[PDB]
Design a protein around this ligand. Structure first.
Ligand SMILES: CCN(CC)c1cc(C)nc2ncnn12
Ligand SMILES: CCN(CC)c1cc(C)nc2ncnn12
Ligand SMILES: [Zn+2]
Ligand SMILES: [Zn+2]
Ligand SMILES: [Zn+2]
Length: 459
């Protein structure tokens, strides 16, 4: 079982207010046909418009919450809502647009999905809390058939144009009018009691219900993210490389070694308490310090309470030496800490919107992270940028412009003139540092940390 069989049963109770008299016994095959689609027994890579929960999790970057509400067999106007916050009104003749015929609405839909998804995914997954109008509106903006490739490139076709009779991916679909071979999943099929708002509001106080289609579409995708990434966590699942993942990760390791190495040199802590990933390795293996590890998995729901991580009886006295919380999200860090906390508010292709203020950070694996809280860092300060090196000044070998910086903490800078080697390493480190900060990571340190203490490690 790789795909969802079209012969799987579909619970239709959620659909019977918009579709009165709908059979209780219904398959995906019969539902697809009822929606106005003919699959014709085609095995060309598109076996079902509906997908499994596991396949949906593998394609989280493609999720677009979708909801349709009736406004007025005589067709009436529909409010189409998307988790992008867009509301389009289609007439059959937060951003909400006036009523226009489907021929122009479908151009808008293709533009919106293409701009939203071109840098995230090779497809779209419509996430539903299916009541009827959304499934029956799909025929007006969706075309299906064999799996195809783009006319302008090698990516899979996600759009279709009736003007040119051609296919395109999200990058080459300017002016296209039809969504081609989309995927969809109905959250209501997962076994739930009560309406969408009641289930969403159990875990999220951030998304309100301003009684608009996009509000429901947003709540839908949010509840789906909570079920698949907050309550259930799967760190085995791999995700494709779509950006700067490798550079961001390489930067993180360089910044960690640099910042921890300098803390141990400036304040000579006898012991370091490394709290976080159970698979963590010594980030400064040559350091003199007594390195003690504590296992805590990435918290995906609420940030850890320091009272449960530290107290209840390890040195036991965590007040001795320094605490290293490298991506270990706690509610209030102790004053003797070195902290890297991901800022969930960051705008990027790796960071997807999440549940209750949190975000879904997708870099090789999916990590639902709790909402960034400035109050977690009251006992600390923002760690300033600095580069430190004790390596010999020796070129061994891009051209050269002389480096003048107060933050290049090297023997050559102490001696009044930065050597070529330390200037190259400084600029490479600053690049890695800016790369990590812009990816969303934030660095915090114990208030007594001072890089002035690093000059005397040169004599
Ligand atoms: C009351 C019949 N009507 C309205 C025309 C329906 C019913 C269904 C199941 N799908 C539909 N798709 C579009 N109209 N539509
Ligand atoms: C209420 C029945 N249905 C299907 C759920 C309808 C009715 C009307 C008037 N327009 C529609 N456009 C799409 N579906 N649809
Ligand atoms: Zn293309
Ligand atoms: Zn929510
Ligand atoms: Zn030097």
């Amino acid at each position: 079982p790789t795909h969802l069989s079209v012969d799987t049963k579909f619970k239709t109770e959620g659909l019977c207010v918009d579709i009165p008299g709908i059979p209780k016994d219904m398959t995906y095959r019969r539902l697809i046909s009822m929606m106005g689609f003919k699959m014709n027994y085609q095995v060309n890579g598109y076996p079902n418009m509906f997908i499994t929960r596991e396949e949906a999790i593998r394609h989280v970057r493609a999720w677009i919450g979708f909801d349709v509400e009736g406004c007025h067999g005589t067709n009436l106007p529909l409010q189409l809502g998307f988790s992008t916050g867009v509301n389009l009104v289609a007439v059959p003749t937060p951003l909400m647009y006036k009523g226009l015929p489907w021929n122009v609405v479908r151009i808008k839909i293709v533009q919106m999905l293409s701009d939203t998804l071109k840098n995230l995914s090779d497809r779209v997954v419509f996430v539903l809390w299916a009541h009827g109008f959304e499934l029956t509106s799909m025929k007006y903006f969706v075309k299906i058939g064999p799996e195809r490739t783009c006319c302008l490139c090698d990516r899979r076709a996600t759009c279709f144009s009736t003007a040119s009779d051609t296919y395109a991916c999200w990058h080459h679909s300017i002016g296209f009018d039809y969504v081609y071979n989309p995927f969809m999943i109905d959250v209501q099929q997962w076994g739930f009691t009560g309406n969408l708002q009641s289930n969403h509001d159990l875990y999220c106080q951030v998304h309100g219900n301003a009684h608009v289609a996009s509000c429901d579409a947003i709540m839908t995708r949010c509840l789906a993210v909570h079920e698949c990434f907050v309550k259930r966590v799967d760190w085995t699942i791999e995700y494709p490389i779509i950006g700067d993942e490798l550079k961001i990760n390489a930067a993180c390791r360089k910044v960690q070694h640099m910042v921890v190495k300098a803390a141990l040199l400036a304040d000579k802590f006898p012991v370091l308490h490394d709290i976080g990933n159970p698979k963590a390795i010594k980030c400064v293996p040559q350091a003199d310090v007594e390195w003690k590890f504590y296992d805590a998995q990435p918290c995906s729901d609420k940030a850890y309470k320091i009272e449960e991580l530290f107290y209840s009886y390890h040195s036991d006295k965590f007040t001795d030496g320094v605490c290293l919380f490298w991506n270990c999200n706690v509610d209030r860090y102790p004053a003797n800490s070195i902290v890297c906390r991901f800022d969930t508010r960051v705008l990027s292709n790796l960071n997807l919107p999440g549940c209750d203020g949190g975000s879904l950070y997708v870099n090789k694996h999916a990590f639902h992270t709790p909402a960034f809280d400035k109050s977690a860092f009251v006992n600390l300060k923002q760690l300033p940028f600095f580069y430190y090196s004790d390596s010999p000044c020796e070129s061994h070998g891009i051209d050269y412009v002389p480096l003048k910086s107060a933050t290049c903490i090297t023997r050559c800078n102490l001696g009044g003139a930065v050597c070529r080697h330390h200037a190259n390493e400084y600029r490479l480190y600053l690049d890695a540092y800016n790369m990590m900060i812009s990816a969303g990571f934030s660095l915090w340190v114990y208030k007594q940390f001072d890089t002035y203490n690093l000059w005397n490690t040169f004599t």
